[PDB]
Design a binder for this molecule. Structure first.
Ligand SMILES: *[C@@H]1O[C@H](CO)[C@@H](O[C@@H]2O[C@H](CO)[C@@H](O[C@@H]3O[C@H](CO[C@H]4O[C@H](CO)[C@@H](O)[C@H](O)[C@@H]4O[C@@H]4O[C@H](CO)[C@@H](O)[C@H](O)[C@H]4NC(C)=O)[C@@H](O)[C@H](O[C@H]4O[C@H](CO)[C@@H](O[C@@H]5O[C@H](CO)[C@@H](O)[C@H](O)[C@H]5NC(C)=O)[C@H](O)[C@@H]4O[C@@H]4O[C@H](CO)[C@@H](O[C@@H]5O[C@H](CO)[C@H](O)[C@H](O)[C@H]5O)[C@H](O)[C@H]4NC(C)=O)[C@@H]3O)[C@H](O)[C@H]2NC(C)=O)[C@H](O)[C@H]1NC(C)=O
Ligand SMILES: *[C@@H]1O[C@H](CO)[C@@H](O[C@@H]2O[C@H](CO)[C@@H](O[C@@H]3O[C@H](CO[C@H]4O[C@H](CO)[C@@H](O)[C@H](O)[C@@H]4O[C@@H]4O[C@H](CO)[C@@H](O)[C@H](O)[C@H]4NC(C)=O)[C@@H](O)[C@H](O[C@H]4O[C@H](CO)[C@@H](O[C@@H]5O[C@H](CO)[C@@H](O)[C@H](O)[C@H]5NC(C)=O)[C@H](O)[C@@H]4O[C@@H]4O[C@H](CO)[C@@H](O[C@@H]5O[C@H](CO)[C@H](O)[C@H](O)[C@H]5O)[C@H](O)[C@H]4NC(C)=O)[C@@H]3O)[C@H](O)[C@H]2NC(C)=O)[C@H](O)[C@H]1NC(C)=O
Ligand SMILES: *[C@@H]1O[C@H](CO)[C@@H](O[C@@H]2O[C@H](CO)[C@@H](O[C@@H]3O[C@H](CO[C@H]4O[C@H](CO[C@H]5O[C@H](CO)[C@@H](O)[C@H](O)[C@@H]5O)[C@@H](O)[C@H](O[C@H]5O[C@H](CO)[C@@H](O)[C@H](O)[C@@H]5O)[C@@H]4O)[C@@H](O)[C@H](O[C@H]4O[C@H](CO)[C@@H](O)[C@H](O)[C@@H]4O[C@H]4O[C@H](CO)[C@@H](O)[C@H](O)[C@@H]4O)[C@@H]3O)[C@H](O)[C@H]2NC(C)=O)[C@H](O)[C@H]1NC(C)=O
Ligand SMILES: *[C@@H]1O[C@H](CO)[C@@H](O[C@@H]2O[C@H](CO)[C@@H](O[C@@H]3O[C@H](CO[C@H]4O[C@H](CO[C@H]5O[C@H](CO)[C@@H](O)[C@H](O)[C@@H]5O)[C@@H](O)[C@H](O[C@H]5O[C@H](CO)[C@@H](O)[C@H](O)[C@@H]5O)[C@@H]4O)[C@@H](O)[C@H](O[C@H]4O[C@H](CO)[C@@H](O)[C@H](O)[C@@H]4O[C@H]4O[C@H](CO)[C@@H](O)[C@H](O)[C@@H]4O)[C@@H]3O)[C@H](O)[C@H]2NC(C)=O)[C@H](O)[C@H]1NC(C)=O
Ligand SMILES: *[C@@H]1O[C@H](CO[C@@H]2O[C@@H](C)[C@@H](O)[C@@H](O)[C@@H]2O)[C@@H](O[C@@H]2O[C@H](CO)[C@@H](O[C@@H]3O[C@H](CO)[C@@H](O)[C@H](O)[C@@H]3O)[C@H](O)[C@H]2NC(C)=O)[C@H](O)[C@H]1NC(C)=O
Ligand SMILES: *[C@@H]1O[C@H](CO)[C@@H](O[C@@H]2O[C@H](CO)[C@@H](O[C@@H]3O[C@H](CO)[C@@H](O)[C@H](O)[C@@H]3O)[C@H](O)[C@H]2NC(C)=O)[C@H](O)[C@H]1NC(C)=O
Ligand SMILES: *[C@@H]1O[C@H](CO)[C@@H](O[C@@H]2O[C@H](CO)[C@@H](O[C@@H]3O[C@H](CO)[C@@H](O)[C@H](O)[C@@H]3O)[C@H](O)[C@H]2NC(C)=O)[C@H](O)[C@H]1NC(C)=O
Ligand SMILES: *[C@@H]1O[C@H](CO[C@@H]2O[C@@H](C)[C@@H](O)[C@@H](O)[C@@H]2O)[C@@H](O[C@@H]2O[C@H](CO)[C@@H](O)[C@H](O)[C@H]2NC(C)=O)[C@H](O)[C@H]1NC(C)=O
Ligand SMILES: *[C@@H]1O[C@H](CO[C@@H]2O[C@@H](C)[C@@H](O)[C@@H](O)[C@@H]2O)[C@@H](O[C@@H]2O[C@H](CO)[C@@H](O)[C@H](O)[C@H]2NC(C)=O)[C@H](O)[C@H]1NC(C)=O
Lengths: 563, 144, 420
């Protein structure tokens, strides 16, 4: 009407400018008051003519228009005024925290943390046990939310915490929140009264109960600690939850002192405790997994006399059975020598023993040199105790190794020298000795000595042969052939063969031989004869073959010259 | 109050010798046997594989050769005798003896007379304490 | 006077008791003082009346009288006092050692050991060469006296000491005092440079000079020893004396080492060396007694080819000429076989050869049996060397004997039968 602009420059920044066919009209929108060329800031809620907001609706000016805002929980619908609608079904009329539930109320909406939780509905700072089952209140970033302990716990792998571990110094003041124990640290909280100075702490803590069944929710359990002689004098209250996969999680809070620490039993994940030494018999019992020695090491005095020693080329070692020390009450063993820089340590080859080493010289590790003319000797002392201090008995083991000063040494590699040798062949013709004798008796006792003898036909002529030399046991005497001759000349046609072809002659039963080929003594017996003719003298000649018993049988097995 | 119990242990040092090829005593052999000629020079040295104390010196009390591995054999050819080198042959030499742990004797090859083809080497040795004994062999000469 | 005893019991044991007609008088003798019934011990030099001992004479008491003793060298003569007299003319005023001379001196006598001796005249410890000629200081019992070495020496009959003897092991540290060499041990100390490893010792000692003439006194002589290649590098000094009967005696002291020993040459007491083999021609020369082979055995190669063999009925022998071995430089011969229990030794029938024996069996002495159809054979090897070890050449002699397996035998005794 009266605000017809010539150009858009006559519209302000508080009015909307509209160009229609290049004709500029300024019309100032609701929430600004005036004619339209100039409209200054003034709420549409208070202008001549007013607006159209319902009775409850508190008119609010906006830069460009006007809005009818009802008491939050109701919204103005045209022709109806304030009408009921949920405000927690619109993601722009509600922004409550992820764990806060929205509740539309008359005039606003409230954000409400769930039952148990303690908060305003913007941070739902829950307390232990204030969550529903399966969830626990744990921090996440900078707020506290209900999360399952099986996904929000920490883990602990402190080997020291082992009950047998008696050395060290600890304090569990750091521990808060849920924790788990995996690996060396053990599988579960200790459930038994633990001795003093165990679990690397002064006073050990243990669980006063039995772990719940798998997937049982958070349950509270009693906790006990041991000191002096009274076990579980003061009683606490810890909480424990089982998780799927067979493990547990625990609320390990700082103790009331600085010498209290929780313990764990051995995992014993293997049915048979093969980790334990072969000399510490494993006890394979249901629910009772451990290992201990048999009766042999259940006695005190003989254990005090028990030991073993080993002298090496460059080092000396003395060792005692750890089981024996444990049986003598020395669960922890302290081995010291004349020089404190040398300290005992585990065998690391056979775990039963515990041993210390000493270099075989004078000056290091306190070893000395005792020498005499025969051979040198090294002497050193071993000190045994249960702790640093000694109260009742101070047993010192005096040991020594003897090293011989004179010994045999042999070079192993033999030698095969080469020499230029000259060989020249030499040969020599030789001759054995053979002789025969004429005996008188059938027992072959006296030889003759005269150049000639006289005899009768009826007389029996016993003769034997012998070797005056070369009486080898394996060389036998074999009569290849024997014959008689009228003259000393061997080459005579007139021969009377007596032994022929290794067999005795026939046509006369007096031709006998007692032995032939058996041994060196060959005897033939025959009664006297005379050559036919002018021949008065008769001689005896023989040929003989020496027979080797190794190869030839050399018995004449003459079945008979006839047959 | 203290309890004392005596304990004793028999021990044994380690001693070994090697057959070197060079006059510089560089490479030991490893085979169980070797072949050589008479003109070849046989260089041998001894060492302690353990207990190398600075004051313990190596002294050759006597060395000898044997045709067989058996030490108790009547046929012995003493090379080192009474801490002094053998005579009747100028090739019998020792560079060091008693000075330190490295004792070396040099001699050229020989062969036993007879059917004996193989020759072995044996030695006896006395460890000498430098604190008291001089342990130098000052052998003016086995002859004179 | 006032000591008239009624009986001898009133005389003491310090007074002399005299019975005259059964009247007992006690008079105490000089050296005891009193009245006579009791006289207690007191020197007589101070009694009422003094005494009579010469000025020089010390007033000495004796058990029974008072004596006067002068400075030993003078003796108290009555009326004169101390009078000069020799004390070494009385066997009771002198007891000097048998070799000590007595000298009477003013106030004593002295016993004097002779010139050279070092003693007090009680124990004359003489030293070598401190005696007069014809005598030397040697122990006798528990003292040292000057005695002739020809009657106080020891003797030695060690055959080993011979120069040719090259085996063995010795040390002359025991030898001290005078010694002689008789018999096999030789007649006199070696006078020539001896080769190495001789006289059964490592280094041989010899005399550096020529023995003195018979009955020349103790004379010192140079001594030499041989080692390595240098002969008489170090020089000592020995002493030697000739004795009647044509032999010598020597001062053999321990050497400075334990491989030194004196040698002797061959005695050769026989003009011709008949002991030497008939194949080692004796050299009958004045002052040069030995024996060596002729030119036939003065060559090396043919000697290496030279040998002889003998096959016996039960034993086999191989031998080589010892002269040939010596010519080949093998002065000592070492013969070994396949079994070391067999060792060579001297022939003992003809001394020229050296031989070894082997029983004709299999198993002893390493002999084996090689057999074929014709006749058996025995083979064995001989090893030769100069010493235990072999350095340059190892010559082994292969020898064998052939024993026929078929042979002719004849009964010697003929027969003369009787027939009707
Ligand atoms: C069953 O068993 C029996 C018993 O074992 C066997 O019989 C034996 O057989 C052996 C093997 O033949 C014989 O050994 C040889 O003996 C001869 C000498 O024999 C005589 O002397 C011995 C001892 O007294 C006697 O027993 C034997 O009977 C002979 O006696 C009489 O000798 C005269 C001659 O003077 C005869 O006329 C006579 O008939 C005979 N009487 C008989 C037979 O009753 C010996 O000389 C032989 O040595 C030769 O061989 C060696 C080995 O090769 C050589 O040594 C080597 O020499 C090399 C060169 O220097 C050297 O480098 C090498 O290192 C060296 N080796 C060693 C190990 O030392 C000898 O030097 C030598 O060399 C041979 O010499 C002969 C000459 O003698 C050469 O012959 C000549 O040849 C030329 C041509 O080239 C011409 O033709 C000439 O005319 C000819 O003369 C020959 O060539 C040379 N060889 C070479 C150089 O290679 C050897 O020791 C046993 O004696 C014998 N025993 C008996 C009792 O009979 C029988 O055989 C067995 N039967 C069966 C079936 O198995
Ligand atoms: C040069 O140097 C070398 C090197 O040092 C010297 O050689 C060494 O010498 C040492 C001193 O003698 C020896 O020590 C002794 O060793 C024996 C055991 O020796 C054997 O074993 C060792 C180790 O393996 C080995 O080296 C040695 O060679 C021996 O091996 C062999 O053993 C068999 C036997 O099984 C032999 O048959 C065999 O021949 C042998 N081989 C050989 C020799 O080559 C050890 O037993 C000794 O201990 C004894 O002495 C201790 C000190 O007194 C006692 O301790 C004390 O006991 C008291 C009681 O309980 C206690 O109250 C006290 O507090 C305690 N003291 C201390 C400090 O602890 C021992 O108990 C023990 O007591 C003696 O025991 C023996 C038996 O063994 C008794 O002898 C018996 O006596 C009765 C009569 O009464 C009958 O006659 C029995 O028949 C007889 O057997 C003896 O009486 C007991 N004495 C008591 C009770 O007082 C000691 O440790 C070294 O081994 C030796 N080394 C070598 C390599 O040889 C050498 O000598 C030097 N030379 C020179 C010149 O200087
Ligand atoms: C692992 O386990 C260990 C051991 O449990 C945890 O460490 C410590 O645990 C204790 C015990 O939970 C905490 O102490 C206090 O716990 C109460 C619990 O109250 C909430 O849950 C109630 C239901 O819970 C039951 O079950 C639990 C066991 O799970 C029992 O302990 C309970 O007693 C119940 O039986 C619920 O009923 C509560 O609401 C009502 O009651 C309480 C009564 O105290 C009222 O306040 C409420 O207004 C309401 O009416 C509640 O939902 C907490 O409420 C305690 O909060 C204290 O601290 C707040 C801030 O620090 C403070 O704002 C509170 O007002 C209150 O402080 C006041 O009251 C205390 C009463 O003891 C006084 O101590 C204090 O002086 C003051 O007067 C408190 O949290 C330890 O805090 C806790 N310590 C740590 C370091 O965590 C360990 O946390 C576990 N690990 C985890 C969860 O990861
Ligand atoms: C076979 O022959 C062998 C080889 O000769 C004998 O073996 C050893 O021989 C030697 C040499 O004789 C002995 O050594 C010493 O000898 C002197 C000799 O002195 C006496 O005689 C002097 C004259 O002799 C001359 O001729 C001889 C050769 O025949 C020469 O050796 C001499 O040098 C002369 O040339 C005479 O003059 C001496 O008196 C004076 O001079 C000496 C100088 O040394 C002074 O002492 C005297 O006081 C005096 O002034 C003397 O009469 C000995 O005197 C030696 O005695 C030593 O030992 C005594 C005890 O052991 C000791 O009391 C002495 O004091 C003296 O020891 C001192 O002097 C030594 C000098 O070398 C030092 O060595 C020593 O360190 C110390 O300082 C000594 O005896 C060997 O002893 C002797 N060995 C053995 C084992 O016998 C062998 O004996 C003969 N076999 C027999 C006789 O059967
Ligand atoms: C050393 O020995 C003790 C026990 O000593 C044992 O009993 C003594 C009275 C003597 O007879 C000893 O010679 C004998 O070895 C071990 O301590 C433990 O003692 C208790 C005591 O009651 C044992 O309990 C018994 O066990 C048996 C078998 O199961 C039951 O039948 C009984 O009813 C009772 O429960 C316990 O077994 C035992 N522990 C063992 C043997 O390991 C000590 O441990 C042992 N030391 C060594 C290193 O072996
Ligand atoms: C001033 O506020 C009151 C509430 O305090 C208003 O009364 C409300 O009026 C609306 C509109 O009719 C009602 O909504 C209705 O709800 C039913 C049930 O959900 C639905 O079916 C209808 O379609 C409609 O949405 C609402 O229930 C009612 N509230 C009460 C408590 O009765 C009143 O209208 C307001 N004044 C003005 C001028 O708007
Ligand atoms: C004190 O001692 C001295 C000697 O030191 C005495 O003088 C010695 O007197 C005697 C006796 O007259 C002398 O002996 C005489 O010797 C000669 C020669 O042999 C001989 O012919 C005499 O017959 C007599 O034996 C002696 O020589 C003399 N000595 C000296 C050195 O003159 C003196 O008499 C002594 N006094 C007393 C009181 O004993
Ligand atoms: C324009 O307003 C009329 C009348 O509403 C009246 O005036 C308003 C400013 C406010 O004061 C109301 O409460 C007054 O009633 C709306 O018509 C409806 O009128 C009835 C009768 O009173 C009333 O009950 C309803 O709530 C009104 N409907 C509404 C306010 O939506 C008319 O609908 C309004 N036009 C719109 C909002 O576009
Ligand atoms: C007894 O004594 C007289 C006198 O000797 C003097 O008195 C001695 C004890 C003694 O001291 C002497 O030296 C005194 O001279 C002996 O007569 C000799 O007198 C002279 C003169 O003095 C004197 O030189 C002589 O040596 C004396 N003769 C000795 C002492 O033999 C008298 O001989 C003595 N009677 C004896 C010894 O039987």
């Amino acid at each position: 009407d009266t605000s017809e602009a010539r150009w858009c420059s006559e519209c302000h920044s508080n009015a909307t400018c509209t160009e229609d066919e290049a004709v500029t009209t300024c019309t100032c929108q609701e929430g600004f008051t005036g004619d339209g060329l100039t409209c200054v800031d003034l709420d549409e809620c208070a202008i001549p003519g007013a607006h159209n907001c319902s009775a409850n609706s508190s008119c609010v000016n906006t830069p460009g228009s006007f809005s009818c805002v009802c008491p939050e929980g109701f919204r103005l619908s045209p022709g109806l005024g304030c009408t009921d609608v949920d405000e927690c079904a619109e993601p722009g009329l509600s922004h409550c925290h992820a764990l806060a539930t929205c509740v539309n109320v008359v005039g606003s909406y409230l954000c409400v943390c769930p039952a148990g939780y303690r908060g305003d509905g913007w941070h739902c700072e829950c307390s232990p046990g204030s969550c529903g089952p399966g969830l626990d209140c744990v921090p996440e970033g900078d707020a506290l939310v209900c999360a399952d302990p099986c996904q929000a716990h920490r883990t602990l792998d402190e080997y020291w915490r082992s009950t047998e571990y008696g050395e060290g110094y600890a304090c569990d003041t750091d521990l808060r929140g849920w924790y788990r124990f995996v690996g060396q640290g053990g599988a579960r909280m200790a459930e038994t009264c633990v001795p003093v100075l165990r679990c690397n702490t002064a006073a050990p803590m243990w669980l006063n109960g039995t772990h719940p069944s798998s997937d049982e929710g958070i349950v509270s359990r009693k906790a006990c600690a041991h000191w002096s002689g009274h076990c579980c004098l003061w009683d606490a209250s810890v909480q424990v939850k089982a998780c799927a996969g067979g493990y547990y999680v625990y609320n390990l809070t700082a103790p009331p002192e600085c010498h209290l620490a929780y313990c764990t039993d051995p995992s014993s994940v293997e049915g048979t405790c093969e980790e334990c030494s072969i000399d510490e018999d494993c006890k394979s019992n249901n629910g009772r997994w451990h290992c201990q020695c048999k009766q042999d090491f259940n006695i005190t005095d003989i254990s005090l006399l028990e030991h073993r020693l080993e002298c090496g080329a460059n080092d000396m070692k003395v060792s005692l059975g750890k089981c024996q020390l444990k049986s003598l009450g020395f669960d922890k063993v302290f081995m010291y020598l004349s020089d404190s820089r040398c300290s005992g340590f585990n065998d690391r080859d056979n775990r039963d023993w515990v041993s210390v080493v000493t270099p075989a010289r004078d000056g290091p590790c306190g070893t000395v040199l005792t020498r005499n003319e025969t051979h040198a000797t090294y002497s050193n002392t071993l000190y045994l105790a249960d702790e640093i201090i000694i109260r009742d008995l101070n047993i010192k083991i005096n040991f020594a190794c003897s090293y011989p000063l004179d010994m045999k040494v042999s070079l192993k590699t033999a030698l095969q020298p080469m020499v230029s040798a000259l060989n020249i062949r030499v040969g020599g013709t030789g001759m054995f000795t053979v002789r025969m004798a004429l005996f008188q008796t059938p027992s072959y006792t006296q030889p003759y000595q005269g150049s000639s003898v006289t005899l009768s036909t009826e007389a029996f002529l016993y003769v034997g042969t012998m070797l005056d030399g070369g009486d080898l046991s394996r060389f036998a005497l074999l009569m290849t052939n024997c014959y008689a001759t009228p003259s000393s000349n061997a080459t005579d046609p007139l021969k009377y063969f007596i032994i022929q072809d290794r067999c005795p002659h026939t046509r006369d039963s007096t031709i006998q031989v007692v032995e032939n080929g058996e041994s060196s003594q060959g005897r033939f017996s025959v009664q006297m004869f005379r050559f036919a003719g002018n021949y008065d003298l008769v001689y005896l000649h023989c040929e003989v073959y020496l027979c080797d018993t190794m190869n030839e049988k050399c018995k004449p097995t003459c079945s008979g010259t006839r047959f």
